[PDB]
Amino acid sequence: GDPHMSKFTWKELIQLGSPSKAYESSLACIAHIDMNAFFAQVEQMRCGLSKEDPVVCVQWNSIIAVSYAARKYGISRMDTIQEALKKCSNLIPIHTAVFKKGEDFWQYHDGCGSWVQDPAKQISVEDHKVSLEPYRRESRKALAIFKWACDLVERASIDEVFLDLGRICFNMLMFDNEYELTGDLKLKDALSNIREAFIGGNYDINSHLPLIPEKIKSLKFEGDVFNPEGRDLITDWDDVILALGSQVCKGIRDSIKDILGYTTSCGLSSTKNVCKLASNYKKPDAQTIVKNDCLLDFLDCGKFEITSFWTLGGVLGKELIDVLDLPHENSIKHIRETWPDNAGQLKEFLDAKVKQSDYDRSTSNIDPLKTADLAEKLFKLSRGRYGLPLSSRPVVKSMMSNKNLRGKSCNSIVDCISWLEVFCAELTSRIQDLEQEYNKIVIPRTVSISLKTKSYEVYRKSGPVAYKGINFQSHELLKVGIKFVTDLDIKGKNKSYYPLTKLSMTITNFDIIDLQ
DNA sequence: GTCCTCCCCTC
DNA sequence: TGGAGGGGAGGAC
Ligand SMILES: Nc1ccn([C@H]2C[C@H](O)[C@@H](COP(=O)(O)OP(=O)(O)OP(=O)(O)O)O2)c(=O)n1
Ligand SMILES: [Mg+2]
Numbered sequence: 435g436d437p438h439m440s441k442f443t444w445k446e447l448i449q450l451g452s453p454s455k456a457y458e459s460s461l462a463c464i465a466h467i468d469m470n471a472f473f474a475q476v477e478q479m480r481c482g483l484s485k486e487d488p489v490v491c492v493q494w495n496s497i498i499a500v501s502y503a504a505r506k507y508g509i510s511r512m513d514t515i516q517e518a519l520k521k522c523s524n525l526i527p528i529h530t531a532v533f534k535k536g537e538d539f540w541q542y543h544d545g546c547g548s549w550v551q552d553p554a555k556q557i558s559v560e561d562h563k564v565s566l567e568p569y570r571r572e573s574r575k576a577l578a579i580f581k582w583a584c585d586l587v588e589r590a591s592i593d594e595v596f597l598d599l600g601r602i603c604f605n606m607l608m609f610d611n612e613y614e615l616t617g618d619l620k621l622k623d624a625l626s627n628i629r630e631a632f633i634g635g636n637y638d639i640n641s642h643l644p645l646i647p648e649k650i651k652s653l654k655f656e657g658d659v660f661n662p663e664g665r666d667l668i669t670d671w672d673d674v675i676l677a678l679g680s681q682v683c684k685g686i687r688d689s690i691k692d693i694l695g696y697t698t699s700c701g702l703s704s705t706k707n708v709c710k711l712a713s714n715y716k717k718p719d720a721q722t723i724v725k726n727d728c729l730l731d732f733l734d735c736g737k738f739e740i741t742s743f744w745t746l747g748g749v750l751g752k753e754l755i756d757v758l759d760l761p762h763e764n765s766i767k768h769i770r771e772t773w774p775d776n777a778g779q780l781k782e783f784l785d786a787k788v789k790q791s792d793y794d795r796s797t798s799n800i801d802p803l804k805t806a807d808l809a810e811k812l813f814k815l816s817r818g819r820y821g822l823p824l825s826s827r828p829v830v831k832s833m834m835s836n837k838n839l840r841g842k843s844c845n846s847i848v849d850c851i852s853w854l855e856v857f858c859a860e861l862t863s864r865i866q867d868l869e870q871e872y873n874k875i876v877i878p879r880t881v882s883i884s885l886k887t888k889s890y891e892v893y894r895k896s897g898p899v900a901y902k903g904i905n906f907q908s909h910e911l912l913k914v915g916i917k918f919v920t921d922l923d924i925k926g927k928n929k930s931y932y933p934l935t936k937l938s939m940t941i942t943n944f945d946i947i948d949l950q
Numbered sequence: 951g952t953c954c955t956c957c958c959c960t961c
Numbered sequence: 962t963g964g965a966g967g968g969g970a971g972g973a974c
């Protein structure tokens with residue numbers, strides 16, 4: 435009993451086979467996979483260049499992605515192209531594709547940009563908008579590969595996915611009769627006791643698993659195991675599952691590399707939040723694995739603060755630093771040691787801060803009715819044990835077309851509508867591509883126009899768009915756009931308004947119809 | 951009841 | 962940065 439048995443139960447293991455519940459198991463095996471230098475790799479592949487070519491993706495005068503080759507010269511995202519040229523004589527800057535105002539398609543103008551001397555080879559900010567479609571297209575191809583490999587994939591941003599490897603790990607653990615640990619030892623023989631129990635079917639779901647067999651310690655992790663204290667690699671079933679998951683994840687990443695050409699970095703752990711930190715730890719082309727017994731070593735390595743966690747990077751994180759009196763460094767360890775035993779300790783502390791007459795609820799981002807959830811979230815995050823589910827997203831949720839405007843390039847309603855015509859062409863084209871690619875009817879329901887005046891004042895309007903089929907979709911979007919921009923022009927009467935500094939159209943709500 | 955506006959989160 | 966995109970609160974309707 436107890437230290438004579440695993441820390442984990444049959445329930446926790448069997449849960450890995452449930453897509454709805456696998457994430458809440460302490461045995462969960464989550465991967466976060468992030469494309470290295472994504473937009474720069476897309477341009478590299480498009481132009482038939484190699485990983486040794488110092489490519490940068492350029493948007494107007496800013497570098498928005500830097501190849502690992504260019505990084506060797508000290509080039510950083512948001513360098514200007516001129517600053518980058520001073521660091522690397524052999525630099526290959528490639529401008530994003532663009533739409534020209536007055537046209538209804540996008541294209542690349544290779545050999546063109548602000549760095550080019552020839553005045554015939556400029557891509558003027560007055561006259562063009564960006565197309566990110568080449569990057570979106572490649573993102574969707576990658577998504578298709580991830581979903582072919584794994585039954586639960588969350589697209590987290592244009593170049594990131596989370597994978598729940600629970601079913602793959604479980605199935606391998608229990609059923610894989612071919613996997614070799616050594617030249618003399620198969621996985622099936624190493625795990626003969628647990629497989630016998632499982633097939634025998636005689637276990638109690640609430641009973642602890644047996645201690646791991648010595649023979650499973652021959653199982654190898656694939657990738658970089660984060661382990662500065664030199665802890666034993668395989669000591670319980672979580673380590674077994676994680677090691678199996680590292681083997682599978684390398685195979686998935688190799689499929690991405692072989693089919694599309696892209697290198698990835700990857701984080702492997704029992705939770706999404708730790709995976710995301712681990713994927714960014716080592717780049718390019720690496721997989722960082724964070725064992726449960728190494729979570730505190732990792733979180734406390736000095737790279738991370740509580741604000742490093744998803745949702746805590748902005749004003750709520752800053753409020754929590756003030757409310758919880760967190761230090762400027764080693765805040766994660768501080769949270770852990772100050773409320774060491776349970777989340778109720780932290781909840782009690784929060785409730786007192788919040789119940790004070792002088793706490794301003796109208797400006798706070800803390801919900802005083804939800805302090806139990808906040809306390810548990812902070813308690814578990816500080817220990818690397820906050821498990822969030824993965825969501826499989828619809829084909830699309832929202833779609834935006836945006837132009838930040840310089841000079842007088844939008845100086846009247848005539849100019850606004852000219853830009854709306856580009857937005858409507860772009861959005862309709864994106865919708866048609868999704869319909870073809872996923873065999874759906876994709877129907878915009880709501881549109882929002884947002885703009886900024888010369889004084890940077892925001893004006894916005896949203897409402898319904900009618901549907902008449904794909905062949906009338908651009909027209910239906912433009913009808914609403916024109917309506918909204920003229921309405922806002924009236925609202926701006928006698929106020930600082932033209933020339934605008936920004937105009938955007940967003941389809942904020944879609945209906946998606948499946949076809950047989 | 952849902953819709954519109956404004957705001958906060960991320961890459 | 963610009964140009965995305967995800968998500969939710971709460972008063973308007
Ligand atoms: N503020 C940002 C951040 C990123 N991107 C784009 C360019 C990136 O290539 C892509 C993915 O973002 P990442 O943060 O993953 O950065 P990279 O993939 O470029 O580099 P890394 O190898 O560090 O992941 O999104 C952008 O347009 N604006
Ligand atoms: Mg990336």
Ligand SMILES: [Mg+2]
Nearest residue numbers: 468591594961
């Ligand atoms: Mg990213």
